[PDB]
Design a protein around this ligand. Sequence first.
Ligand SMILES: [Ca+2]
Ligand SMILES: [Ca+2]
Ligand code: NA
Ligand code: NA
Lengths: 104, 109
Amino acid sequence: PNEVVVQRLFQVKRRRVVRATEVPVSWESFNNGDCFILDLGNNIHQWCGSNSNRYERLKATQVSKGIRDNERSGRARVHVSEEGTEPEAMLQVLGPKPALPAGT
Amino acid sequence: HHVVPNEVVVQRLFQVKRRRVVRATEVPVSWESFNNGDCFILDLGNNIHQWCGSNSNRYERLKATQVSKGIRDNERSGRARVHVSEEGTEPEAMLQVLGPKPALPAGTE
Ligand SMILES: [Ca+2]
Ligand SMILES: [Ca+2]
Ligand code: NA
Ligand code: NA
């Protein structure tokens, strides 16, 4: 009998969906590969890891400004910070910052 | 009912994360299946053609390499050659199967 080849095509694609999920208020929840939003009512702290991607950064900005504008009527301030510039108000709530995992 | 109404603030933390899974799925063998934001593997038996769009990410490229080598080493017992191409360098073997290349969308939309 003759040998056959089945001609095939694979598409290799990473899922695009970017989720914002509520997680425990703790440094435990942080990793340097994503973005995080700490909502404190009058103040909203947006924190992006050094290995976060541009879709996560965009989504984080939409979520933080969305809370400020569509939930606080614009009566809230968004503070953007990163590794090493975390403001005292984050540190009061989360406590002293430890080493964070790189991702996942 | 005189009251002193004290506002409650619930402190919350949100994680913003793009899903990590890279999928590899069979699609119709056609240029109509291609886009410039993903990677593709055209499996022609003895020859496996790996093609990465200009807007693909490193995880799609790594997964395409892993799947191509899996086809080569598992399903073909090593009796196959992987050829890497990209936009503008598609070999004649790809054009023979897919026909002349049209303009491709930049991504999925
Ligand atoms: Ca991430
Ligand atoms: Ca892609
Ligand atoms: Na074969
Ligand atoms: Na080539």
